[PDB]
Design a protein around this ligand. Structure first.
Ligand code: VGL
Ligand code: CL
Ligand code: CL
Ligand code: CL
Ligand code: ZN
Length: 212
């Protein structure tokens, strides 16, 4: 294939059982993006997978906060936190990659959200805005300056990963038809707006696949 250059990477965000139909935080139709992701990954020299990877006592779970229910919000030290159903607990079926995901060439699996008291939608920086995950250092050591983001959810882990990539100096693109969103209280269109404002490029898979 006519692959993307060595300075670009595909970051495949949270294509896990937990976020796909049948999972504990199932995003409708999120499994339908997987064939596109599998095909895209073949076109990149460098591919990183992310995995939401929570301990059972994670702060982002509604179940760990008395009197709160999923999809409500809570004020934590670091700001507003959406509370979720328990999802993607370390070592469980829910946290596994979706069985249709097929990227044997993937070079890194970075887990996130493993600190009990801090969420991390972004693969680059945790929800405290200060705890760096290691991904920036990894990518820059490998000479990567351009990041393409796909996966689930468009408006949370994808958007926050993309916005953090921009903050860290990467040319950042999101491949829209290889993402699926959840849209809580208008989050989906707001994520696209904030991403566009910050210079994230919104592209379609055919844009990349037609030069592969
Ligand atoms: O992958 C995501 O977008 C995500 C992760 N944890 C909770 C909710 N959403
Ligand atoms: Cl739950
Ligand atoms: Cl299990
Ligand atoms: Cl840090
Ligand atoms: Zn999570």
């Amino acid at each position: 294939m006519n692959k993307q250059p060595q300075n670009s990477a595909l970051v495949v965000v949270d294509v896990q059982n937990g976020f796909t139909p049948g999972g504990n935080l199932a995003v409708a139709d999120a499994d339908t993006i997987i064939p596109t992701i599998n095909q895209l990954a073949g076109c990149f020299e460098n591919v990183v997978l992310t995995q939401d990877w929570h301990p059972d006592n994670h702060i982002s779970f509604a179940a760990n906060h008395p009197g709160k229910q999923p999809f409500e919000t809570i004020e934590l030290d670091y700001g507003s936190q959406v509370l979720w159903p328990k999802h993607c607990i370390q070592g469980t079926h829910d946290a596994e990659f979706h069985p249709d995901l097929n990227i044997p060439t993937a070079q890194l699996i970075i887990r996130k959200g493993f600190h009990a008291h801090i969420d991390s939608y972004s693969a680059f920086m945790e929800a405290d805005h200060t705890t760096m995950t290691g991904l920036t250092g990894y990518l820059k050591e490998r000479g990567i300056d351009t990041v393409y983001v796909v996966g689930i959810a468009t408006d949370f882990c994808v958007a926050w990963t993309a916005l953090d990539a921009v903050k860290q100096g990467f040319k950042t693109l999101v491949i829209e038809d290889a993402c699926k969103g959840i849209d809580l209280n208008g989050s989906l269109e707001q994520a696209w707006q904030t991403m566009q404002q910050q210079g994230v490029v919104r592209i379609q898979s055919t844009d990349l696949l037609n030069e592969c």
